[PDB]
Every structure is written in structure tokens, then in C-alpha cells.
């Protein structure tokens, strides 16, 4: 074993450098050339609030087992993660660093780091994904507190003590640092805004939420107080080890990446614990726009399946808004969830309604319209009743965005409806004026269909299209469908 300053980073990183002409983003979807230029212990700016710097940390804190899983990580980024932990953490609080090599292409990426003081390397015999890889590390951990980090992170000054302090006081707090940004193109370390919380929209993709005016005002007494958060990112958090185990680890049927941070956030809040972001704790993370690795079965499929498993277990009736937002997820089998449903039951977890009202009151229920009401627009003109009733013609007029004569609905009956009147093809002879008549289910003259990417209206069972060319000489007509601006119509929602 060597102390990390004696580790031969040049030999290690030199084995896998990008060659001349080669794409520096191909392997990792960040710039490996810029990662490889950095020293393993490169200095980073202290991004903490001034109030953090005047802090003495409770002394008798529990040591942690740091679990880092990785799959085909750049050697420079993985090493720099390990070193940031060893250099920026008090040694007596680092029991061990467990690297879980999740079936990387090259087993030396991990094996060579095994040389370093306090590093334990666990290589998976097959691809396991981050969830099962994290449970593997966590099951192997000897300490009383778990820390999970992604494999391209850089810990900052006194990042660890503020997290440990929270968990030492209350074992049911699951806590994360502010996620500073390591730029994926040039690897500069930049501080994140401290005014953020974790959240999601109904498509159940994690996002950062900006604090409301009132939330910020309430924090002026102490801007470094813990931020209670509806959701944590997955890349860095600290959790009491027994709490992790008792509360159900991670869902072992989740694969590769995605949705475990959603699942664990719901679980922790619904089953009586809490989530916090801790401003005095800062850890940089290389954010990316694409995953560099394979998803056995397809990245869309996998992510949807993982999310279904979380939604079906935690979200009660609210899961319906996810399927509404992501219809395609309905097509994705998700396997057996009994273990997880029973876990929820055993722990007497609270309903999702409880979470929305008490944890994430900012998330607004989606706004439902089974039917399209609005304008049928052609440039700056709108389909207009002209103020006519049954047997009158229709036309186009400057859009006034005031509904009225310019408000229509596209019915499931395949009609074009204003109140109880429908656009009626009284004569199929090309060039004929259409008329309003009372809507009847059984009037084939009143049936229209949107065609060409919802850009024209064709009369069902004909090759006739609604046409405005006759507007100045009597009103809208049916005309043979062809390339004419006068046959273009966009339904614009109210």
C-alpha cells in the first residue's frame, strides 16, 4: 500500500490517454484531454458561504465508509475523486473507500487504485448497474455511516463533517452536499447557486427548483441552515448504514441508471425520515448531457422501467399523471414489485398525497382537457362564424384572441364545432361553400380529419380540404386537396 501522494498518477493516467486526432468526448461524454491534464490533488476554489468558515465541527462524529461505483470511468476522474476524499476529509472519519467496479472494460482501472491507502476494490463479475453496485458496496461497508459519491466528483473544504453532524444527531436524516459544477469541456470547478432544492415535474425526471421568494426570506437568519428538499440528486449523499438497510437499501430490480434517487427520496419522506441539502458541504460533479455507456435493453426502456417501479410503489393515484406525461411508459413491463409494496406496508409509510402537501406543495396537479378548444388559424387569420347560425357560411377574420366567433372544438365525433353548430359539406362538388348546420353524430357531411401533421382539414371519405380561397367571394369552400396556403390551418389551444 502507498499513501496517495506517492501514487504514480502519470503511469496510471498515461495508459489510457486520448490519441492525436481522436475525439476527446467519445469515451466519457466529457473532455478526457482536459481531465487528464489535471493533477489528482488539483486545488479547487472554496465555494462555501463565509458563515461556513467560522464553524467548529462536533468532535465525536462517526467514521464513514465511502462507496464509489463506476463503469468505464476516465482514470484521471476516478483517481481525482478518491484523492479528493482522502485529502479533504479528516483521516479518522474515513474508515475506507470502497470502489465497486461495475464490470468495466479494463479491470486495471480499478485494480491499480487498490494500491492506495484505504481503498478496497470490488469488481462485479457481470454488469450490475449503479443500484445493485451501490448495495454491494453498502453490504461490504464496515462503518456505521454510508457515503455514496459518483466516480467523477471533487470534494471541497470540510465537506464531510457538516453531513456527518446531521446524521449523528438524527439517524433518519439523509443528507447531500450542494452539487458544484465541474465543466465537462474544460474541467473548471464552479459553485452552484445555494438557492436551490431538488424536485421533479410529472414526467418524474429529477430537476433543480429555485426557492420561492418566501423560502429565501425565511433563511436570512441563517443562510447555511439545512435546506429540506423534496428530492436529492443521486451523485452524493450520506446515510446511517442501519437506516439504509432497514428502510430497504435500493430496489434491487432497478437496472443501470435512473429513478433510484426518485425512489429513495419518496421512500425516505413517506416512511418517516427526511432529506436535506447542506450548504456548508460542497462536492463538485461532472454533469453530462449524454451517458457514455450501454444500457442493456435500451436507455429509454431501462429508465422508464426503473421509474414505473418507483411510481407504482410510491405514488398511489398520482402515478396516473406520470403516464399522462409519458404515455410511452405504459408500454414498458416493470416486473414484480411485491417486496417493495410489502416494505411500504411494513414501515407504515404515509400516502403520496401526504408527501405532495407537506414535502412538495409547489408541485401543481396537471391541467386536464380531454378535448381541444381554441382557434383554427391561418397566418394571422382565424376561422370565423361571421356571426352566422344554421345555413350561413363561414369565413376568416383577423385573430382577436377573444374566442366568440373564433372559438372551435375538434370533437371525438370528427366534427368541427362552434357551440351546437358544425361545419357541414352540403355539396361535395369541388369549389362549393360549406355551411353551419346543427351538429348530428349521424351526418357524414360533418366529418373532418386533420392531415399532414395536423396542418390541413380533409372531409372524411373525400379528397376535399377546407379552403379559404373563396372567402372574399362567398365564404370557405371544399376544394381538391393540394398545395395551397389557403388549405393550411393550425389549431391553436385557447
Amino acid at each position: 500500500k502507498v499513501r496517495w501522494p506517492d501514487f504514480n498518477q502519470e503511469a496510471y493516467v498515461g495508459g489510457t490517454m486520448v490519441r492525436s486526432g481522436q475525439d476527446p468526448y467519445a469515451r466519457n461524454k466529457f473532455n478526457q484531454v482536459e481531465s487528464d491534464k489535471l493533477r489528482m490533488d488539483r486545488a479547487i476554489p472554496d465555494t462555501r458561504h463565509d458563515q461556513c468558515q467560522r464553524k467548529q465541527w462536533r468532535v465525536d462524529l462517526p467514521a464513514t465508509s465511502v462507496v464509489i461505483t463506476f463503469h468505464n470511468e476516465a482514470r484521471s476522474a476516478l483517481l481525482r475523486t478518491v484523492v479528493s476524499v482522502l485529502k479533504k476529509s479528516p483521516p479518522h472519519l474515513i474508515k475506507e473507500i470502497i470502489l465497486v467496479d461495475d464490470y468495466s472494460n479494463d479491470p486495471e482501472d480499478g485494480a491499480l487504485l487498490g494500491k492506495i491507502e484505504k481503498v478496497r476494490v470490488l469488481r462485479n463479475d457481470r454488469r450490475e448497474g449503479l443500484m445493485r453496485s451501490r448495495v454491494r458496496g453498502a453490504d461490504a461497508a464496515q462503518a456505521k455511516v454510508l457515503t455514496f459519491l459518483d466516480s467523477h466528483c471533487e470534494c471541497n473544504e470540510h465537506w464531510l463533517e457538516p453531513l456527518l453532524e446531521r446524521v449523528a444527531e438524527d439517524r433518519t436524516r439523509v443528507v447531500s452536499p450542494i452539487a458544484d459544477v465541474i465543466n465537462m469541456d474544460n474541467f473548471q470547478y464552479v459553485g452552484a447557486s445555494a438557492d436551490l432544492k431538488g424536485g421533479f415535474d410529472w414526467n418524474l425526471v429529477f430537476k433543480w427548483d429555485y426557492m420561492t421568494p418566501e423560502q429565501r426570506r425565511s433563511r436570512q437568519g441563517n443562510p447555511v441552515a439545512p435546506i429540506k428538499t423534496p428530492m436529492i440528486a443521486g451523485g452524493a449523499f450520506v446515510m446511517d448504514k442501519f437506516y439504509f438497510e432497514e428502510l430497504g437499501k435500493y430496489d434491487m430490480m432497478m437496472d443501470v441508471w435512473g429513478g433510484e434517487n426518485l425512489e429513495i427520496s419518496f421512500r425516505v419522506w413517506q416512511c418517516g425520515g427526511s432529506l436535506e441539502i447542506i450548504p456548508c458541504s460542497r462536492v463538485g460533479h461532472v454533469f453530462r448531457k449524454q451517458h457514455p455507456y450501454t444500457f442493456p435493453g435500451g436507455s429509454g426502456t431501462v429508465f422508464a422501467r426503473n421509474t414505473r417501479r418507483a411510481a407504482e410503489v410510491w405514488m398511489d393515484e398520482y402515478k396516473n399523471f406520470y403516464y399522462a406525461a409519458v404515455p410511452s411508459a405504459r408500454n414498458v413491463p416493470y416486473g414484480n414489485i411485491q417486496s417493495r409494496l410489502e416494505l411500504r406496508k411494513k414501515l407504515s409509510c404515509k400516502p403520496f398525497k401526504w408527501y405532495l402537501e407537506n414535502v412538495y406543495p409547489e408541485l401543481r396537479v396537471p391541467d386536464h382537457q380531454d378535448i381541444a378548444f381554441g382557434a383554427l388559424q391561418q397566418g394571422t387569420n382565424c376561422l370565423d362564424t361571421l356571426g352566422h347560425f344554421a345555413d350561413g357560411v363561414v369565413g376568416v377574420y383577423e385573430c382577436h384572441n377573444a374566442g366568440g366567433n373564433q372559438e372551435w372544438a375538434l370533437t371525438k365525433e370528427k366534427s368541427v364545432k362552434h357551440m351546437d353548430l358544425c361545419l357541414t359539406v352540403v355539396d361535395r362538388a369541388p369549389g362549393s361553400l360549406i355551411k353551419l348546420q346543427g351538429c348530428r353524430e349521424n351526418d357524414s357531411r360533418q366529418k373532418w380529419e386533420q392531415i399532414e401533421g395536423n396542418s390541413k382539414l380533409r372531409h372524411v371519405g373525400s379528397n376535399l380540404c377546407l379552403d379559404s380561397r373563396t372567402a372574399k367571394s362567398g365564404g370557405l369552400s371544399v376544394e381538391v386537396c393540394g398545395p395551397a396556403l389557403s388549405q393550411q390551418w393550425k389549431f391553436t389551444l385557447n
Partner: peptide, 9 residues
């Protein structure tokens, strides 16, 4: 597709 970056300071 991936965890998004927070807005910077």
C-alpha cells in the same frame, strides 16, 4: 437523459 446541472452562483 442525465442528471441536470444546477444554475451556478
Amino acid at each position: 437523459s442525465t442528471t441536470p446541472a444546477p444554475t451556478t452562483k
